[model samples]
Target: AVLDLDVRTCLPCGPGGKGRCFGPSICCGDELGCFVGTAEALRCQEENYLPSPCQSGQKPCGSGGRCAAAGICCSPDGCEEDPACDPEAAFS
Candidate 1:
């Protein structure tokens, strides 16, 4: 007596099927390690993806001035932290 066999077999039987599997193949070794590394590389692309203003000691020059060393007002004349100290001012 003869019997015809048509069954799917394990191409590579793993330890309790612990390795990775995709479509119709059993993935293992460096191929699995490369998949994990690709995922981690994508995370680095999304870092610091936001708009920010100037940091300390930096000012947005709008009123005819620049950022001074001490984070104060700066112009062609000199730098001052306060406008009240202007020599030509009415108060001081």
Candidate 2:
């Protein structure tokens, strides 16, 4: 599965259906390690970056995020989890 969270594609979690979740601090999936390289990231120590307008009745997939039909104003379930949608990880 294409786990490009930048595109907000965190679904198709590779294994055990754990979750390719994105939050405020940590983004992670069962198949792949946190894109953000760190003791924190590798272990999903932070939050999942999942934000979206729930007006459409679209519950944020993965990690079982729940919300009413309104503006969730969230980041999304997976921002490519690549440490940095910042692209800094790629620099390294």
Candidate 3:
């Protein structure tokens, strides 16, 4: 006798599975993290796969803009000019 087992994807709590799959986050399948919508899936991808410039400790600021020392990505405005990218400011 042979036993056949099928693995299924988990369902998301948000509409069309628009949330993360890891930890307490809601997903679609029981074990397999399945994101149904493109936006949701893309967001997951960005969170997991995107490379951080600060993680590498590289400063690649452009047009007199300096890389904000506090975070990973740089902003369109100079580090000192933009509060969002200010190293001295509290992150939101």
Candidate 4:
């Protein structure tokens, strides 16, 4: 019955998975997804893939990043975790 074991691929990034857009691609899964960056993420969303939904209460990053999820902020470079996600210091 293991005859169809030729497929070794996996989909870790699906519906609640820990995957994120690594770039502008659909290596992404049902829950989480690929390794596309912010620009790439958005780019892919515009092209075909479904974009990550932004959470409420979270703020945008001063470094041109977006509050993609609960505590995940993505930028052109990658998923950022810097304080830049909340540029309150700039106002202060």
Off by over 4 Å in 2: 1-21, 33-92
lDDT of each: 0.27, 0.33, 0.31, 0.37
Model 1 has a clash total of 0
Deviating ranges (above 4 Å) for candidate 4: 1-13, 16-23, 26-59, 82-92
List per-candidate RMSD values in Å.
Answer: 28.9, 15.1, 16.7, 12.4
lDDT of 1 at 55: 21
Report the number of the highest-TM-score candidate: 4
The segments of candidate 1 whose C-alpha lies over 4 angstroms from its true place after superposition are: 1-60, 82-92
Question: What's the number of clashes in each of the models?
Answer: 0, 16, 9, 13
Runs in model 3 lying further than 4 Å from the true structure: 1-18, 22-37, 49-92
TM-score of candidate 3 relative to the true fold: 0.17
Over 1-92, each residue of candidate 4 has an lDDT whose tens digit, in order, gives 12124432222233434443433343232234224543323334443444333322225655445553333455445543344423222322
Q: Write the per-residue lDDT of candidate 3 for residues 1-92, one digit (tens) a residue.
A: 01112332222333454333322221222222233333333433433454322122124543233332333123222223223343333662
